[PDB]
Amino acid sequence: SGAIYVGNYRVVNRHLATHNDWANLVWEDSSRDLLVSSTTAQGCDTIARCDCQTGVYYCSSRRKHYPVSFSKPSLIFVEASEYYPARYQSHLMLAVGHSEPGDCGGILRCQHGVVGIVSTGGNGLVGFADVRDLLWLDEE
């Protein structure tokens, strides 16, 4: 579990979105596994606007932050997980690290703020769902 809290927006894994998230929907994309909902209180997070390929992500299934190199956001094939089938997922970055289903929503950060959240795992990779292209997270 986990969420990016930027202005009056909450960014979660679409597959973990709550009834409240859907009741206060701003934007969703199943192909990216992202959903954005509106918040009453403002958020403590800043979004990275950058082409960084090195950062630190939180792994809940290890209680640990791990420094990682990660690929640029691409359309990638992703093997069947407990929360999705084997399928293509867009705007996805892969690093070499540990990711179990429960790890989804853990933050990846670089020197520029929040890059994205955990979304995929298995075979010793961790996929992150980039949010740097979502320019509208920083307005309105």
Ligand X SMILES: Cc1ccc(CC(=O)NC[C@@H]2CCCO2)cc1
Catalytic residues: 15, 33, 104
Residues 16-22: contacts with CB under 8 Å, at least 24 apart: 16/83, 16/104, 16/105
Distances (CA, A) of 100 to 18, 54, 87: 20, 21, 17
List the interface residues with ligand X, window 23-62 (CB under 6 A): 27
131 binds, among Zn ion, ligand X, none (CB under 5 to 8 A by kind): none
133 binds, among Zn ion, ligand X, none (CB under 5 to 8 A by kind): ligand X
52 is annotated as contributing to ligand binding = yes
CB of residue 15 to ligand X, shortest distance in Å: 18
List the interface residues with Zn ion, window 40-59 (CB under 5 A): 48, 50, 52
Residue with smaller CB distance to Zn ion, 48 or 107: 48
The reply on whether position 78 binds Zn ion by CB under 5 A is no
Reported as half-sphere exposure (CB side, CA atoms, 13 A), residue 88 has a value of 3
SS3 22: helix
The reply on whether position 74 binds ligand X by CB under 6 A is no
Q: Which residues pair with 81 in a beta bridge?
A: 84
Residue list for the binding site: 50, 52, 110, 112
Residues in contact with ligand X by the rule CB under 6 A: 27, 133-134, 136
